[PDB]
Design a protein around this ligand. Sequence first.
Ligand SMILES: [Ca+2]
Ligand SMILES: [Ca+2]
Ligand SMILES: [Ca+2]
Ligand SMILES: [Ca+2]
Ligand SMILES: [Mn+2]
Ligand SMILES: [Mn+2]
Ligand SMILES: [Mn+2]
Ligand SMILES: [Mn+2]
Lengths: 6, 6, 6, 6, 237, 237, 237, 237
Amino acid sequence: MYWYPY
Amino acid sequence: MYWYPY
Amino acid sequence: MYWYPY
Amino acid sequence: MYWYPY
Amino acid sequence: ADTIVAVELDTYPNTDIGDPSYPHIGIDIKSVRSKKTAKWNMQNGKVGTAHIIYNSVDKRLSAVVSYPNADSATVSYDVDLDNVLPEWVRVGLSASTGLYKETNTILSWSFTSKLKSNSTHETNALHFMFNQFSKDQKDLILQGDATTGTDGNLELTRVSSNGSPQGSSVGRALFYAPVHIWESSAVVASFEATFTFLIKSPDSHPADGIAFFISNIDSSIPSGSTGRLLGLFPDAN
Amino acid sequence: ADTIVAVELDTYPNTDIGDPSYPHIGIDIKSVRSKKTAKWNMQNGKVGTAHIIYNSVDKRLSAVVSYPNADSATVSYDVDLDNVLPEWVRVGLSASTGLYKETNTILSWSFTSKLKSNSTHETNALHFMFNQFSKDQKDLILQGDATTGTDGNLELTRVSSNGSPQGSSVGRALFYAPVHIWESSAVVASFEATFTFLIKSPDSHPADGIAFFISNIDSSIPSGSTGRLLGLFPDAN
Amino acid sequence: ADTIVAVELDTYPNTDIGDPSYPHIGIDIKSVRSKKTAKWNMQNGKVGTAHIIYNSVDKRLSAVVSYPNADSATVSYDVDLDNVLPEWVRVGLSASTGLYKETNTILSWSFTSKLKSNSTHETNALHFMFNQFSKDQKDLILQGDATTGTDGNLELTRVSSNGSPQGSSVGRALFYAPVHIWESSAVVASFEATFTFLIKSPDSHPADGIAFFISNIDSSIPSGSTGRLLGLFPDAN
Amino acid sequence: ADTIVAVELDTYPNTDIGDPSYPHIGIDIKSVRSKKTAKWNMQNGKVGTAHIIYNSVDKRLSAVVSYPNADSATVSYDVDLDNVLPEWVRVGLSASTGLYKETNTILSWSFTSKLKSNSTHETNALHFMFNQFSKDQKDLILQGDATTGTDGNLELTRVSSNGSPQGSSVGRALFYAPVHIWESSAVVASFEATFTFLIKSPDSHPADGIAFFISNIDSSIPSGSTGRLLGLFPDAN
Ligand SMILES: [Ca+2]
Ligand SMILES: [Ca+2]
Ligand SMILES: [Ca+2]
Ligand SMILES: [Ca+2]
Ligand SMILES: [Mn+2]
Ligand SMILES: [Mn+2]
Ligand SMILES: [Mn+2]
Ligand SMILES: [Mn+2]
């Protein structure tokens, strides 16, 4: 689970 | 010379 | 990582 | 209708 | 009835059903009354080319008709094909003649369809190209008076032995395999069609036109669709 | 009856009819007894690639099957297709199981056929590419137990709900539109096919294989062509 | 200076130079201040795809950026390229990092350009496709910190041995051969570019972006064009 | 020095160095003394077509030259290019005249190179097609007397204002970007070339021919390679 900055 | 109707 | 039948 | 050299 | 989207190369102005007062090109969405047209300086007896493009990102159907060393005619229309055509359709060429005639000869026809579903780059594509038609063209569905074989070319409408166009004639040529024109999960769907025609009219008074169309898989020529109907629509509403 | 030409990926050695004592790749010309074979280090459970090529200039049919980071097998046979097939044909994929079984999954399939006749660069071409199969694949003719959909893959033979291969299964996939494979007048005619498969057998000692074939337009599965017959031939002659 | 048209995948919002308040995609015409943008839900660590299309008939440049099983970002801008770019140009990919970093990895890149002059169908076309880059990619012009070889991929910006992105880095990759993007006598000119990227950011705070650009044949990285300038423009006017 | 591999269209029989007693097509591997030839019924003043094909599976280089409605000549030689060329090369067209002369006009030229390595369907490809040459052809490297423009044609050798062939002329056309012709790890590598020429000689008894060649990236015309040397070799060894 690699997915979020913003 | 073959080209025109309208 | 199933199978070589050889 | 130039030329075949044969 | 059938569902039909077509780009028409109209040669006779029937300004009684919405037609412009001159030879034009237009985009038809389920009706013979074009959504938008554009004056087309048709050159009797000269070979010409028609380019049709459309992509799902812009949802814009555009067409270009040109003649070597001449100004070209261009027409576009913002239309979302997902809400007009079933996802599986057939593509083809239709032409007609009525009181007045012309030859509706096709010298070549190529088509390319790309579909990219969201499993990305996984791309499905169909591409066919015709540079010459043989007498027995099995990958083609000929309807009406349409015939191939006339040495290389595809005669959409009736032409006599001596080579003159006949009146009241209708013919179509659809590609055998169905085409997947659009799909819900599609990231990008596009297609482009190209064909070269030769509209010849001994009595400089041509009619009625040639068209590139897309329709339901089982579309067939409507009754009395000769002349002004270009063999695509049943009436003129 | 039918006319077949195929490149078979034979997974089980039926010595009783010519098969070499090992999984192999072969070229079949109107007979299940390959005119030529090459051994194939098949890898149960691994995704592989098949490549078939041919051109009229060399009249040599060659195939390459390989697996990522492993050696590939190659086989070639000199043959003039003009003297074997009708000029119009259909192309497809065939697979079968018998006593022993295996999944015969196609993850992608693309074909390209080009024919250049006797007129300045007039080239006729057909190209299709399936990177994903939909549940309703209208441009494919499924015969026997063949089915598409199950999340984008073409399952040539029976597969249970849980995913295991069923014995005694047969299935074929033929591209809807006919292919003009040769013309008694073309300078050069060529075609190339590629498809990635996945052969997985639990009861290890798999059977019977997958084959890329070319046949008469109206070919159908011969009765009793399960197992060793690969759903292509009616007998082992 | 250079003349640059680019589609940018901006990951850091520098809303001080016109940037939106979130990761976006935009079209830049000779300036870093995009003519039009569109919110882009960037997914750190996921492979994505970018499709760019443009044809001379519509004179509209469009781009689509998507991620498997996710909504896509789309942006278009009506712009006539004939009056912005020289007829011969070079195409490539540029990326950058500054205070904050990310990996700007390219996994594949394909490009296709078609030009049809009015001597009709006489078509000139260029097409290249990269699915894997080798350590010594001679048909590519690498600039700045751009490198290939990292087993298949093209690293536009600096990445350490262990695999983490470095700050203040600039790199570009231009195709060796010049491209004929437009021509006066052209009936129809089009091109489409596709590439898959992998923007990874250990500290969920990526920057600065990747871009597909078109420029004069001798364009090179401008000074201090790291970070927010994506290695394309000298200033931010 | 240079590394050459070429398919020559030899118009004059230089028996003093191996040439057969007649116009021929040949395959040259690092020597002007063809490893194999086939006679060629050349037709002065007629537009012709050349077709060169090769694939790594068969490792067989074949060429076909023909004229509309006339027989074609074919030649093939088995060779493993991996053991002859560097993995990166340039492709081009070469032509020459000597005492006797001839026009060596190229009306169109297209090339396609595909390389599929060891990873699921990863295919690298390059394709260019010239259906018309512009005066300023930036994607071509012209050497010697080669010139483009003169209304869309590539004139490999000297031609006077009035249009007659000059003796003692040499000229080559190489595609700007390097080509990755083989890779020590590709399942299949192949390339195919096609070009239409026009060889016309007034002082009938024409010389010396046109050749499609593949060489090291930095190849140049050897001095004194006019006439019998086809602008490819420095001597007849
Ligand atoms: Ca009308
Ligand atoms: Ca068997
Ligand atoms: Ca920014
Ligand atoms: Ca000679
Ligand atoms: Mn109309
Ligand atoms: Mn067998
Ligand atoms: Mn921005
Ligand atoms: Mn020779």
